[PDB]
Structure formats: C-alpha cells, structure tokens
Amino acid sequence: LYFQSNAMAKSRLLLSELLDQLSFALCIVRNDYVIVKVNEYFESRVIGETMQGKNILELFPESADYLKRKIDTALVIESSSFSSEQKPHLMYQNLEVIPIHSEDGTIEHVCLCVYDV
Amino acid sequence: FQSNAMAKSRLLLSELLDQLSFALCIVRNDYVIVKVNEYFESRVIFDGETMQGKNILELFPESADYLKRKIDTALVIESSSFSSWEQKPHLLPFKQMYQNLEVIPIHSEDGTIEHVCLCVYDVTI
Amino acid sequence: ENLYFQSNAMAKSRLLLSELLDQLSFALCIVRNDYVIVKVNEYFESRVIMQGKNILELFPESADYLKRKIDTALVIESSSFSSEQKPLLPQMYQNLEVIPIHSEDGTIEHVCLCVYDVT
Amino acid sequence: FQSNAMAKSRLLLSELLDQLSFALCIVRNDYVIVKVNEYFESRVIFDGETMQGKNILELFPESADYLKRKIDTALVIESSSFSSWEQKPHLLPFEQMYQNLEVIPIHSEDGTIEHVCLCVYDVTIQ
Numbered sequence: 001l002y003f004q005s006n007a008m009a010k011s012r013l014l015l016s017e018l019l020d021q022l023s024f025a026l027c028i029v030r031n032d033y034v035i036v037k038v039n040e041y042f043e044s045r046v047i048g049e050t051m052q053g054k055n056i057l058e059l060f061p062e063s064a065d066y067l068k069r070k071i072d073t074a075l076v077i078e079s080s081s082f083s084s085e086q087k088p089h090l091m092y093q094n095l096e097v098i099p100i101h102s103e104d105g106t107i108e109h110v111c112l113c114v115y116d117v
Numbered sequence: 118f119q120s121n122a123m124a125k126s127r128l129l130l131s132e133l134l135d136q137l138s139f140a141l142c143i144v145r146n147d148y149v150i151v152k153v154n155e156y157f158e159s160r161v162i163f164d165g166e167t168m169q170g171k172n173i174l175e176l177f178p179e180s181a182d183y184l185k186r187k188i189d190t191a192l193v194i195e196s197s198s199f200s201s202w203e204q205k206p207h208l209l210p211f212k213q214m215y216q217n218l219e220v221i222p223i224h225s226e227d228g229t230i231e232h233v234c235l236c237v238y239d240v241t242i
Numbered sequence: 243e244n245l246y247f248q249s250n251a252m253a254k255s256r257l258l259l260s261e262l263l264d265q266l267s268f269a270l271c272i273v274r275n276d277y278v279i280v281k282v283n284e285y286f287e288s289r290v291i292m293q294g295k296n297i298l299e300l301f302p303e304s305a306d307y308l309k310r311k312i313d314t315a316l317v318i319e320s321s322s323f324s325s326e327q328k329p330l331l332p333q334m335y336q337n338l339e340v341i342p343i344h345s346e347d348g349t350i351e352h353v354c355l356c357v358y359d360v361t
Numbered sequence: 362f363q364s365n366a367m368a369k370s371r372l373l374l375s376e377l378l379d380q381l382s383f384a385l386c387i388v389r390n391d392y393v394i395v396k397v398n399e400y401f402e403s404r405v406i407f408d409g410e411t412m413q414g415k416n417i418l419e420l421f422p423e424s425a426d427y428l429k430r431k432i433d434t435a436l437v438i439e440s441s442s443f444s445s446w447e448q449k450p451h452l453l454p455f456e457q458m459y460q461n462l463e464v465i466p467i468h469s470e471d472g473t474i475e476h477v478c479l480c481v482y483d484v485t486i487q
C-alpha cells in the first residue's frame with residue numbers, strides 16, 4: 001500500500017464492495033399495476049422486450065397473488081410494508097412497498113424494492 | 118408525508134448506484150482473471166465462476182489486441198492509466214455515449230506488478 | 243454535467259460519490275454492559291465534543307433515554323429501532339438503532355448504537 | 362443469533378464509508394470556493410457557510426504556493442492530475458499515513474475551464 005497505484009486499486013475495490021452491498025431492485029407501479037419506472041438493476045437481473053411500461057403481475061405470474069396483495073395493502077392502508085421464500089425470478093428476498101401521494105393526497109403509485117439476502 | 122420521504126430516498130439511492138456502477142476485473146501477469154465484480158458478470162455472456170482462472174485475452178479475442186497493449190503499458194511503465202476506449206470492438210455493451218478504461222498496477226511486497234486492475238466506466242452525453 | 247469532455251465525467255463521478263457517502267453516513271459506537279464505549283466511528287467522533295468513556299457520562303441530558311434503550315435490547319435480546327427523544331445527541335429527526343452482541347457463550351456483553359440524520 | 366448479523370453489517374458498512382470518504386472542493390478559476398464537502402468542513406477550522414465565495418489561496422495561505430501550481434497546471438494543460446501531497450504543510454490534518462491530491466478541470470459548454478474540482482484522499486501504510 002506504499003505505492004499510489006495500490007491505494008488506487010484499494011479504492012476501486014472498496015467502492016465495488018460498497019456498491020455491490022447496497023445494490024437493490026427498484027420499480028414504480030401505477031395503481032393499475034403497470035411499471036412507469038425501473039432500475040437498470042432490476043432490468044438486468046430478472047426474467048419480455050423491456051420492463052418499462054407493462055404489467056408486473058403478468059411478468060411474474062408465479063407470485064402475482066403475493067404481489068397484488070402487497071400492493072393493494074399499501075394503497076388502501078396508505079403505509080409502507082416490509083415482508084420476509086423467493087418472490088421474483090432473479091437465503092431469500094425482502095420486499096418493501098411505499099405508497100406515493102399525489103399533490104392532492106391520493107395514492108396513484110407505489111414504490112417497490114426487493115433486496116437480496 | 119413520510120411516505121414520499123421514504124420513496125424519494127429509495128429513488129435517489131437507486132439513481133446514484135446506477136450512475137456510479139462500473140465493471141471491475143483483476144488479472145495476473147498472464148492475463149489470467151482472478152476476480153470480477155457483479156457489474157462485469159452481468160454484462161458478459163459468462164458467469165464469474167467460469168471466468169476464474171481464464172485468460173482474458175483468450176476469453177475476449179476481438180478486444181485482445183487493444184487490451185494487451187493497455188495491460189502491458191501498465192506493466193512496463195509501472196503506473197496507472199486512464200482513457201476513453203479507443204478500439205471499435207468494446208469489451209462490454211453499453212446498457213450517443215462512450216466508455217472510459219482505467220488500468221491500475223498492483224505491486225507485490227517485493228515491488229513487482231503481479232496483478233493489474235481494470236475498470237470500465239460508462240458515460241452518456 | 244456537460245459530459246462530452248472526459249474531465250467533466252470524472253468530476254461528475256466524484257461529486258456523485260461524495261453525494262452517496264453523505265447520504266449513507268451515520269454515527270456508530272459500541273458500548274458494553276458497563277455503559278463504557280469500546281468502539282466508535284470517525285463519523286461519530288467528528289460530530290460530537292471518546293473511547294473508554296461512559297456513554298451516559300458523556301451526554302447528560304440524554305442519559306435517561308439512552309440507558310433505557312440500551313438495557314431494552316439486552317433484555318429482549320433483540321433490536322430497538324426508534325425515534326420520541328427530547329432531552330437527542332448533537333424538526334430534523336435522529337433515529338436510533340440498538341443491536342445486542344451475543345458473546346461466544348450466548349449472553350450479551352455489548353450493544354451497537356446507530357444514530358442517523360434526516361432532512 | 363440474527364443480532365450479530367446486523368451488528369457486523371453496520372460495522373462493515375461503517376468501516377467501508379470511513380475508508381472511502383474524502384475531502385472535496387470546487388473552485389472557480391479565480392480560486393474562489395464554490396462548493397465543498399461536509400467531510401472537508403469537518404477537517405478544517407472553517408465551516409462551509411464561511412468558506413463559500415472566498416479564495417482558497419487566502420484561506421490556506423501556508424499551502425497557497427503548492428495549490429496554485431496544482432490548480433494552474435490543470436488550467437493550462439487542460440487535464441486532470443493525481444499525486445501524493447508533496448509539500449510539507451498539508452491542507453488537511455489527517456504506522457505512517459499520507460495524503461493524495463486529485464485536481465480535475467471542469468469545462469463549460471463553450472469549452473473554457475471555469476471551475477476545477479479538488480479531492481484530497483487519505484492513505485495509511487504499514
């Protein structure tokens with residue numbers, strides 16, 4: 001580590017570890033279950049043409065029951081959820097669902113985050 | 118209220134990680150791959166498992182010429198180098214834009230370069 | 243952010259890294275049953291005016307709240323993510339996280355403390 | 362138990378951020394400070410509010426000579442530079458350790474270099 005090159009490498013390595021640790025899947029779903037926004041991370045690590053602008057329940061029917069509920073919950077109770085095996089075609093995965101309030105106060109969107117464990 | 122706060126937070130975090138992500142690979146003197154990061158794995162047809170202990174020149178022959186010169190430069194002048202990617206066959210896909218390549222020598226206890234570190238970055242203009 | 247020149251890209255890259263670290267930055271120390279501090283963040287030390295001191299002796303106004311939260315974790319043997327604090331450590335909220343540390347035997351000799359900021 | 366998984370996790374993260382953190386400062390081409398890290402503030406006598414709209418060369422006079430040569434290099438050769446901090450008085454106050462300095466020019470739409478970025482990195486040997 002006496003050479004500046006080594007220091008440089010260390011940094012790059014550490015940043016790579018930090019980034020790979022915080023890496024998570026993210027998309028935003030409209031209240032008709034369509035995706036208005038997604039991670040390069042989600043798109044590059046799961047399951048046609050592109051995820052942007054289509055149905056989540058139809059993209060992952062293997063967990064469409066589980067998903068509908070977790071989304072439906074958010075927009076009705078209007079709060080975040082946090083769930084505990086595997087819930088996507090990517091020990092397991094954790095899911096987080098945040099409702100997004102419009103300026104009037106109505107939810108028309110939820111944020112979906114899946115974390116690898 | 119607190120919901121948009123959480124949402125905006127996850128959104129921001131996500132957007133920084135997407136913009137800071139880069140490919141990283143470590144190779145021996147013989148151009149044998151010893152380490153690779155998740156971003157690298159996901160942008161080549163190969164898994165990191167098969168790539169372990171393979172020669173990067175052999176694994177990517179369309180970029181071998183360019184890559185060898187770049188690695189060899191770092192081995193001989195004994196210092197890191199940073200530049201955009203000169204040669205038309207890119208090692209990695211992009212997903213007008215371009216790619217920077219960084220090459221960093223790793224010195225042994227004795228002083229000699231025994232590994233070198235490659236990082237590829239993606240820029241959109 | 244006129245990223246056509248390569249120097250501009252590097253500067254963007256650094257500013258972004260800086261932004262991320264600012265975001266993730268938090269205060270961490272580790273105390274034992276004595277309430278003595280045996281480990282602490284550079285972040286923590288650079289943000290309050292430390293190793294070997296008593297966490298309660300250091301922050302007098304908060305001492306009441308701090309003891310509770312520490313002693314909770316070790317009795318439940320589980321974690322305590324919480325906000326509530328009035329008299330916390332140097333509105334703009336500060337969330338607190340306490341995590342027990344099971345020693346080789348199984349009994350808890352330490353807890354981790356984490357304080358976070360929010361805009 | 363699960364408790365140790367969380368602790369080690371926070372410790373890991375915490376030690377990663379300690380090692381990746383660096384001081385960052387943007388200066389106009391007349392040496393006037395435009396933007397600065399929280400991490401930079403914490404390690405100088407000044408605070409961010411006070412520093413903004415002031416000349417770096419005036420704020421750290423014992424370092425001005427070295428800093429001007431570094432910033433001017435960027436300004437004239439139109440390129441970034443990276444080296445250890447070579448002058449005896451270090452800008453920032455942090456088993457021997459040493460500091461690295463990176464100067465990066467920033468081009469305007471026109472082409473002209475109107476700001477430069479400064480980043481000070483801390484290394485630790487042995």
